[PDB]
C-alpha cells in the first residue's frame, strides 16, 4: 500500500518499486528508496524457442531500457485532442517464459516410414489449443 509499482517486466522478471519514508520530522530530510528484484533462471537456454540452443551463462540488465514508456497518450488543449509521444528512445531478448503466452515447436515424427511433423508444447502446461 505504501509502495508504487513502476515496471513489472516478465521476460527479465524485473520489478521496481519506489517509496518515500518520513525519516525524522524535517520535510527536507526524507530519503527516496528504489528497490529492484530480479529472478534469474539457471536452466533455460539462449533461445527459448529452440531446445538445441546452448546454455546461457551471461545476463545483462540495462535499467534505462526497462523503465521506458512507449504508448501515445491523449492530451486536451481546450480546442482539440491530440496524441503525444511519451519518450523518443522508443528485438529484446526474453530470458524467462510468460504464463500469459504459449510456446510451440515443430518436430519430425517417423512411424512406418512416413514422417508427420506435429506442433509441440515446450512449456509444461501454459495455454490449451
Amino acid at each position: 500500500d505504501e509502495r508504487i509499482v513502476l515496471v513489472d517486466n516478465k521476460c527479465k522478471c524485473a520489478r521496481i518499486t519506489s517509496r518515500i519514508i518520513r525519516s525524522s520530522e524535517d520535510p527536507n530530510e526524507d530519503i527516496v528508496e528504489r528497490n529492484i528484484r530480479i529472478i534469474v533462471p539457471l536452466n533455460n537456454r539462449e533461445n527459448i524457442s529452440d531446445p538445441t540452443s546452448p546454455l546461457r551463462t551471461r545476463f545483462v540488465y540495462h535499467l534505462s531500457d526497462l523503465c521506458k514508456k512507449c504508448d501515445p497518450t491523449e492530451v486536451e488543449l481546450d480546442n482539440q485532442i491530440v496524441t503525444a509521444t511519451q519518450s523518443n528512445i522508443c528485438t529484446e531478448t526474453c530470458y524467462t517464459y510468460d504464463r500469459n503466452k504459449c510456446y510451440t515447436a515443430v518436430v519430425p515424427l517417423v512411424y512406418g516410414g512416413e514422417t508427420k511433423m506435429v506442433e509441440t508444447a515446450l512449456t509444461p502446461d501454459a495455454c490449451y489449443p
Partner: protein
C-alpha cells in the same frame, strides 16, 4: 495353432488416420487352407485382405490380415471377432477384442534422469531414462531423437504399462536409451517425445544434455548498467 489379435493403437489413428484390425495367426503348417475374416455383432460381412509371409525356421507359417474399419466401429466399443478357419482345426478359433468404457482422461507427466555418476567412470556407455507416469488408458508412444534427427527403432527399448500401487487408475512406463561415452561427453542433446490423447496439443517433448541435469558446478555472470537512468 494360436491366434493373436491386436486392436488398433492411438498412434496409428493419429499418424495414419485409418483404423485397422489385425488378427495374426501363427503355428500354421499349410498356407493353402487358411482364411482370415472379420464378422460384426449383427453378422455384416467385413472385407479382409489376407497376406502370406515367408517360411519360419521352425516349420511354421504366419498369415497377416489387414482390414479397413471406421474409427467409430472401434471407438463405439462395438465388439469385433476375427474368424480363422483351418483344415487341421475341428472348430474355428474365435478371439474377442473390445475397448472398455468408464475411463476418465488424465494428463501424463514426463521426467528424464541423467546417467549415473559412477557409470561414466568406467568409460563404456551411458544410459538415459524417460519416465512417464500418471495416465489412463494404457496406450503410449515414446520416440527418441538426437538434435532433430529421429533415432533408429533399435537403440531404445520400451516397457508395457503397469498399474501404479499407490494411486489406482494411473499407470506408468519408461524408455531406456544407450549412448557412447564420448558422444555424451561431447555435449550432444537428446529429446523424449510422447504421444497420448490426454495432452492438449497431444504431443510433448523434453530435452536434456550434459550441462543440464545433475551438473558439477554453476557458472553465472551478471551485469547491471544504467542504474541511475530516467524512470519518470
Amino acid at each position: 495353432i494360436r491366434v493373436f489379435a491386436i486392436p488398433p493403437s492411438f498412434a496409428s489413428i493419429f499418424l495414419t488416420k485409418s483404423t485397422k484390425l489385425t488378427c495374426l495367426v501363427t503355428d500354421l503348417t499349410t498356407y493353402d487352407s487358411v482364411t482370415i475374416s472379420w464378422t460384426r455383432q449383427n453378422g455384416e460381412a467385413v472385407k479382409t485382405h489376407t497376406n502370406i509371409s515367408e517360411s519360419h525356421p521352425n516349420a511354421t507359417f504366419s498369415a497377416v490380415g489387414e482390414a479397413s474399419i471406421c474409427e467409430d466401429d472401434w471407438n463405439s466399443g462395438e465388439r469385433f471377432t476375427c474368424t480363422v478357419t483351418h483344415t487341421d482345426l475341428p472348430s474355428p478359433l474365435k478371439q474377442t477384442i473390445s475397448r472398455p468404457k468408464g475411463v476418465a482422461l488424465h494428463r501424463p507427466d514426463v521426467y528424464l534422469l541423467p546417467p549415473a555418476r559412477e557409470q561414466l567412470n568406467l568409460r563404456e556407455s551411458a544410459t538415459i531414462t524417460c519416465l512417464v507416469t500418471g495416465f489412463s488408458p494404457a496406450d503410449v508412444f515414446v520416440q527418441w531423437m538426437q538434435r532433430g534427427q529421429p533415432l533408429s527403432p533399435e537403440k531404445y527399448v520400451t516397457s508395457a504399462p503397469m498399474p501404479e500401487p499407490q494411486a489406482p487408475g494411473r499407470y506408468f512406463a519408461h524408455s531406456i536409451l544407450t549412448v557412447s561415452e564420448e558422444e555424451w561427453n561431447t555435449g550432444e542433446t537428446y529429446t523424449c517425445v510422447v504421444a497420448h490423447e490426454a495432452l492438449p496439443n497431444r504431443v510433448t517433448e523434453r530435452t536434456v544434455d550434459k550441462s543440464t541435469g545433475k551438473p558439477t558446478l554453476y557458472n553465472v555472470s551478471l551485469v547491471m548498467s544504467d542504474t541511475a537512468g530516467t524512470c519518470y
